[PDB]
Write a protein that binds this ligand. Sequence first.
Ligand SMILES: Nc1nc2c(ncn2[C@@H]2O[C@@H]3COP(=O)(O)O[C@H]4[C@@H](O)[C@H](n5cnc6c(=O)[nH]c(N)nc65)O[C@@H]4COP(=O)(O)O[C@H]3[C@H]2O)c(=O)[nH]1
Ligand SMILES: Nc1nc2c(ncn2[C@@H]2O[C@@H]3COP(=O)(O)O[C@H]4[C@@H](O)[C@H](n5cnc6c(=O)[nH]c(N)nc65)O[C@@H]4COP(=O)(O)O[C@H]3[C@H]2O)c(=O)[nH]1
Ligand SMILES: Nc1nc2c(ncn2[C@@H]2O[C@@H]3COP(=O)(O)O[C@H]4[C@@H](O)[C@H](n5cnc6c(=O)[nH]c(N)nc65)O[C@@H]4COP(=O)(O)O[C@H]3[C@H]2O)c(=O)[nH]1
Ligand SMILES: Nc1nc2c(ncn2[C@@H]2O[C@@H]3COP(=O)(O)O[C@H]4[C@@H](O)[C@H](n5cnc6c(=O)[nH]c(N)nc65)O[C@@H]4COP(=O)(O)O[C@H]3[C@H]2O)c(=O)[nH]1
Ligand SMILES: Nc1ncnc2c1ncn2[C@@H]1O[C@H](COP(=O)(O)OP(=O)(O)OP(=O)(O)O)[C@@H](O)[C@H]1O
Ligand SMILES: Nc1ncnc2c1ncn2[C@@H]1O[C@H](COP(=O)(O)OP(=O)(O)OP(=O)(O)O)[C@@H](O)[C@H]1O
Ligand SMILES: [Mg+2]
Ligand SMILES: [Mg+2]
Lengths: 146, 41, 29, 276, 298, 240, 240, 202
Amino acid sequence: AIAREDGHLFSCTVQDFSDGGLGIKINGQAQILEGQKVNLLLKRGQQEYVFPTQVARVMGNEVGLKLMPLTTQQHIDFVQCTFARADTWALWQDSYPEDKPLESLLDILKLGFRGYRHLAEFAPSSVKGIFRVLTSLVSWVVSFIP
Amino acid sequence: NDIVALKQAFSLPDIDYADISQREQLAAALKRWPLLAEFAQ
Amino acid sequence: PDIDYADISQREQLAAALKRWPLLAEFAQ
Amino acid sequence: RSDEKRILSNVAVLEGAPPLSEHWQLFNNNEVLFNEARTAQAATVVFSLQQNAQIEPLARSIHTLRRQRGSAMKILVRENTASLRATDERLLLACGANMVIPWNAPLSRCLTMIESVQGQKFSRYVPEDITTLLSMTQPLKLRGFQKWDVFCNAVNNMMNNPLLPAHGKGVLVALRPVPGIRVEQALTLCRPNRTGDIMTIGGNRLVLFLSFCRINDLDTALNHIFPLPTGDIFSNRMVWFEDDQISAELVQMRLLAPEQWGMPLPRRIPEPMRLL
Amino acid sequence: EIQPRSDEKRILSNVAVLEGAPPLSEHWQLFNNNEVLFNEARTAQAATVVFSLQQNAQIEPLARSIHTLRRQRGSAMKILVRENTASLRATDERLLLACGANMVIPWNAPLSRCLTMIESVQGQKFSRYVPEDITTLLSMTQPLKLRGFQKWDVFCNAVNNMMNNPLLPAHGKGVLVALRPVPGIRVEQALTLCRPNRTGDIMTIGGNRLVLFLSFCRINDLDTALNHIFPLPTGDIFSNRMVWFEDDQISAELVQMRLLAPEQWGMPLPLTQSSKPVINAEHDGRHWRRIPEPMRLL
Amino acid sequence: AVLGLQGVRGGVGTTTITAALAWSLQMLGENVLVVDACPDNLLRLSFNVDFTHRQGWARAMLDGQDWRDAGLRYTSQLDLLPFGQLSIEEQENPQHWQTRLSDICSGLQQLKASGRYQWILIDLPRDASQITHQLLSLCDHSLAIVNVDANCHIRLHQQALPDGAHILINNFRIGSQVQDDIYQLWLQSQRRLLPMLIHRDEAMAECLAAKQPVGEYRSDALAAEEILTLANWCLLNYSG
Amino acid sequence: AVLGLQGVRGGVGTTTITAALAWSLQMLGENVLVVDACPDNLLRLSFNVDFTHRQGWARAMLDGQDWRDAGLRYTSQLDLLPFGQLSIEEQENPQHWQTRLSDICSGLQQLKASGRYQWILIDLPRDASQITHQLLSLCDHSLAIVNVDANCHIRLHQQALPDGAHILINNFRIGSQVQDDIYQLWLQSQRRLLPMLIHRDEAMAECLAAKQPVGEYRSDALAAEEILTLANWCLLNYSG
Amino acid sequence: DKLNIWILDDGGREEFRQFAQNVGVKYIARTTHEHAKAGNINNALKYAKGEFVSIFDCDHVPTRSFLQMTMGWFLKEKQLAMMQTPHHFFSPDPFERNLGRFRKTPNEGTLFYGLVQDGNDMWDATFFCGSCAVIRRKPLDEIGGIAVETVTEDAHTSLRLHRRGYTSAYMRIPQAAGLATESLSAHIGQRIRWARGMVQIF
Ligand SMILES: Nc1nc2c(ncn2[C@@H]2O[C@@H]3COP(=O)(O)O[C@H]4[C@@H](O)[C@H](n5cnc6c(=O)[nH]c(N)nc65)O[C@@H]4COP(=O)(O)O[C@H]3[C@H]2O)c(=O)[nH]1
Ligand SMILES: Nc1nc2c(ncn2[C@@H]2O[C@@H]3COP(=O)(O)O[C@H]4[C@@H](O)[C@H](n5cnc6c(=O)[nH]c(N)nc65)O[C@@H]4COP(=O)(O)O[C@H]3[C@H]2O)c(=O)[nH]1
Ligand SMILES: Nc1nc2c(ncn2[C@@H]2O[C@@H]3COP(=O)(O)O[C@H]4[C@@H](O)[C@H](n5cnc6c(=O)[nH]c(N)nc65)O[C@@H]4COP(=O)(O)O[C@H]3[C@H]2O)c(=O)[nH]1
Ligand SMILES: Nc1nc2c(ncn2[C@@H]2O[C@@H]3COP(=O)(O)O[C@H]4[C@@H](O)[C@H](n5cnc6c(=O)[nH]c(N)nc65)O[C@@H]4COP(=O)(O)O[C@H]3[C@H]2O)c(=O)[nH]1
Ligand SMILES: Nc1ncnc2c1ncn2[C@@H]1O[C@H](COP(=O)(O)OP(=O)(O)OP(=O)(O)O)[C@@H](O)[C@H]1O
Ligand SMILES: Nc1ncnc2c1ncn2[C@@H]1O[C@H](COP(=O)(O)OP(=O)(O)OP(=O)(O)O)[C@@H](O)[C@H]1O
Ligand SMILES: [Mg+2]
Ligand SMILES: [Mg+2]
């Protein structure tokens, strides 16, 4: 939830967090502007914590927040509500997609093609430039003719 | 609900979680406010 | 109680407040 | 030298507290204090600001004191009630005041601040002409809605003024209204209160310039200006408060052709029923 | 003279000084704490350095850093300390000013007044004298170093030694107050009802009169100290008071006190006698709470 | 089901929460009748009823008329039954009419048995009168409205909540240390505490000034969403 | 002399304001007696009285004892007369004892005529009981406590304040638009409104949890200063 | 009462000293900088007085359940002398960052800390991996502290503990997350150091 200085509260969904900011999504862009101070309400279980924030970006539903200088207790609470949660990393590892050898081969082939295209722009030894451009040219021509 | 998420994710049905931070905060609160201390004990 | 709603429309801020909130306007008529 | 320890102060500086030391003299108003400080050389003069109207005569007195008497004298202005702006404080500092003590600081903080200025000399330059200092209080003298060209000219003239603080001349704000309301309706819901605040509309944007407003205290000014909360009326906000940024935005606003500009335009009721 | 002043407009401030506001100009450089800021300021010559104070534990290291900056980078520099929430006593502010700080900004002043005070010090040269030895300044911050009841002899000697210390503010050393108890209760009983909190607070009993010396206490805030070290309602335990807050007055009163005969001096009641409180009040830790007692309305 | 909302003390937000809950229930498709039992007669104003409208069930029964004529149709899925205006003499002499309002209990029972209204919300005072006890007995379930403060902490230890009533927290504030301490104590000591709490939101303060429920006045407010959560909880748990 | 503080609505802060005003008046040198007329009996807990102390003037009168032995001394210039803890059965049926508490009027008359007490603050409830009417009748002056919100704005137009009562504002917020509108309307319309108001302060929220008056709990707090200003106003105006 | 947090600084930086003073945790800044991290930990052990020592890297943030999920086995097996916890990286690794597959492909090190250490657990060969671990101080004092010979000191001290008869354990739940290498060069360098240490141990 987000708290404004006039006393209006609106719900939001935190989508990403960092050391000094958060990213939230609001269904309809209730009330926020790109410099306003906002109190951010985070819940760890049944306990709610308040953190002062400043709005950095508003792009419709998505809003970027910047954390204000926090005290030590606020730092501890923020870490306990964002980083030191005993559910983020386990679910992160459990959300990894399984292994599909054929899709993996296709991805690695695309990665090699992307690397060749990357080297088709810069070249340490100038001569290699022409050869790399030729390889990329023929490769994408073939890709267009699968 | 982090511990609940862990229990739902990877077994752990018999590990009773001792939230010592909540207990310490509650003890400090009981020390700070005599009304709460009077009603609790 | 002592309520004096006479000459209540002669101020701009009070007029705006009465326009915003129907309850205050309803009481002030 | 001789009266360095002496502290000539107004009565209202101490909220009833007794003279804290032997070196304290209490005066009724900042006129007898001025006359007594004229004879002083290195004393500490603590004025008092009760109401707004006192700023100009107090500035004149501070100017005369810092001119006739050198850099040894310490001049402090203790503000007792919220009767001062940032521009007025800058004027008082320019006229020769060591520092202005805010009303937020209680008596003990004020006494520590008085101890702070001891042994210090006023090395800043105080101009001989006083009118050129008072002219810097409000240089715009133009309120309300202005057309695009007039707005840009006024702001550009303010930016080019050499006798104004750098990066502290004002704030230029561009407001993009939420869909469903035009810019003319936003202009109607816009009532600037000060003399140096101007507004304009062009290209589905409402552009404000608040004179001498600081970037931090922008939401307060906007809340004063608009009747509804700022956030239910506008979707995005762009702010320029540095001189280079404001100048760049102005020169990017002049390349807006007309016909893209703007001018001001000249509940459920329950019904009775029988329950059954 | 540090002749070159090329960074006369550069503002090196702790990130906490700007309470989330964007840097006002291109001249503002922000730092995370007051140790990176000190490292960068060791190379400046005329910049404004704004420190942020949030705890009392970081006053001595901040004092040392300010002392080093002032004794090495000359007088052209401008050192400001911005107290954020609450961290300072008057003595700590005096120590910071004596170490080399131009101005300490109280937490009561909001951000805008803080910025105006920052700009107020521009172009000014620190012309005060900063001693080479920091230990003397650190010792000035607490010159009594004994708390609680003291004998009439020890009390008089300690107060006189404090008043004879030249490295202390004139007419700002403390308040000497003599309290005459309410006729219903005696003076040892009044001694039992006083619980000094700070190290430099002392008291003694003699001649039906309780005298207190509160170190570095101003006259205008004597009632706050008395309310802190006595059941809040002063006047239910003392009848009248005599206050001395000037060096000459305190010295004369000490001279008068020294003439009291030793037979009229007091001693604390034995701990066995500390069974029934003198009045209806209990000292649960560091606070006085008055316990209601039964009575009959007339 | 018939749900009665009562507060441990005045000023907790029982009328505002009643109006918001009725609006959220009618928003989910449930027919709702909202009944005001508080003599102050302030629930009618949240549904854009004029102040001068003195008609109500209590005034109907105190004039010899029929109390069914006093109902109001706010939406097709929401009907309102105001208490009715009482004169100053009647307000200052509550003993001359509090025993004459007993006829409402049988009517409310027959309304419950009719089946037209899937929910009958009652706004109850805490005057310890006969009518309050009778109507609270008519309630299938009840909610106790409290704020997290010392007053409610004392009251919960010295006064009897309705049998089976759950505790609903209103006016949950921001940055109150004592509130956090009391809430921590309640999370362990109180077993009837609901898992959802209403916050101190300006929308709730403004809704009565606009003579609308908070959901109608401002659907993006956090209070409206929390009242919707309460309505879902009531559907899942107070169905029968 | 006798100053009765009554709230236009429950939860406005009558008890805490009464305790703070008593503390400030006794700090100004006045002998003060506080009488808790509210049956909930919460005023005693602001003066460090144990929750298990059931005695009071009302309990003494119900049990047949003497109410003069139910007084508590806090300071030399502040005395407290608690209501006393009533049983659950007594709370459920208030009509069994509301008519048995008449001698308190004569007792307060005797205390007023005695001259021992310069101020007798009475914390009155809002229940339209006979005892509250009698206590208001014996009160020389009245203070009506309101919050700046829609509820109190409506109530000031439909319920009768005690004659000669002055309205006191509590729980005043910062940056609330509807509150500002109502406050300006009251300044231009309410003739009985006092020039002083009390802002929402965490000190007033923590004082009851610390079982102390706000002046004793935190004398530097803004609410304490406002209560001191109100006490000075009462001394200058309500003395005679 | 039974948790002491120490900040060990080999740079003698005053900012860390002030931060430790402000937050209330311990601080040690040794005068002689020898044996690098192993020597720092040994000097810290010379002052710390606790039954268990848990080593955390600077970028690894523990969850609040770490000690409760870890300490159970130390009270069940008296011979246990080392417990290991997975290394998780919320920062994108050079592969994930450059190749654009961050949450799609698993991390480079999640095969090791997800399957290989769990396999080593059966054969009692779960070696110390630097961070996210607990070592009983009584066994660790017998071996003379953290081994200082190789550049991979954790594996060496775990090998010594296993050669003195003490066992080891592994817990699968990720309870600490750190920062991945910021570039391909950093990954190459850290792998080179690990390989050099392992060949030195061999
Ligand atoms: N352009 C512009 N900027 C605005 C306006 N209102 C506020 N600000 C900005 O916001 C700052 C804070 O003003 P405040 O909070 O109202 O606090 C104000 C207020 O309490 C008082 N004050 C200043 N001028 C007036 C005035 O004309 N009337 C009243 N009643 N108070 C004033 O002095 C305080 C300090 O104000 P400043 O130092 O000037 O600093 C002002 C200014 O930078 C506005 O209408 N236009
Ligand atoms: N809260 C608040 N309100 C603000 C502020 N700035 C302007 N206003 C409002 O705008 C009105 C007109 O101010 P103005 O056009 O600058 O014209 C002003 C200005 O020239 C002067 N004035 C009043 N107070 C101050 C002050 O503190 N400093 C200065 N420099 N001028 C002041 O008196 C004129 C009339 O002022 P008012 O009668 O007070 O009426 C003021 C006040 O209600 C602000 O910062 N805060
Ligand atoms: N000898 C003595 N003097 C006392 C005592 N209590 C108050 N004073 C005097 O009263 C002044 C105001 O203190 P305050 O109103 O409590 O307001 C205080 C308080 O909020 C805070 N403060 C200062 N020292 C401490 C401390 O050790 N602990 C806490 N918690 N706050 C402190 O700083 C404010 C300013 O205090 P100072 O600058 O020291 O100035 C103090 C001091 O001169 C006491 O027990 N002994
Ligand atoms: N409100 C208030 N209370 C006062 C004041 N002076 C003393 N006290 C009380 O006295 C207690 C003991 O302070 P101390 O012995 O000087 O020992 C103090 C002191 O050495 C230090 N401290 C805390 N705040 C400050 C501060 O602002 N300045 C300085 N120099 N030291 C401080 O922390 C120690 C513990 O202080 P606390 O835990 O807060 O507990 C403090 C506080 O409750 C005052 O001016 N105002
Ligand atoms: N969650 C909330 N946030 C902010 N204000 C609220 C909230 N809930 C209620 N209020 C406000 O509290 C005031 C009183 O609440 P309400 O009108 O519901 O009275 P009540 O306590 O239920 O009944 P009564 O006052 O008759 O005892 C109103 O002005 C209302 O707008
Ligand atoms: N100005 C204030 N700021 C903050 N909290 C306040 C303020 N005034 C009162 N409170 C808090 O409001 C709560 C209830 O107030 P109080 O008990 O005085 O009201 P009341 O009118 O006596 O209620 P009741 O109807 O239960 O007798 C308490 O927790 C109190 O601390
Ligand atoms: Mg109601
Ligand atoms: Mg009450």
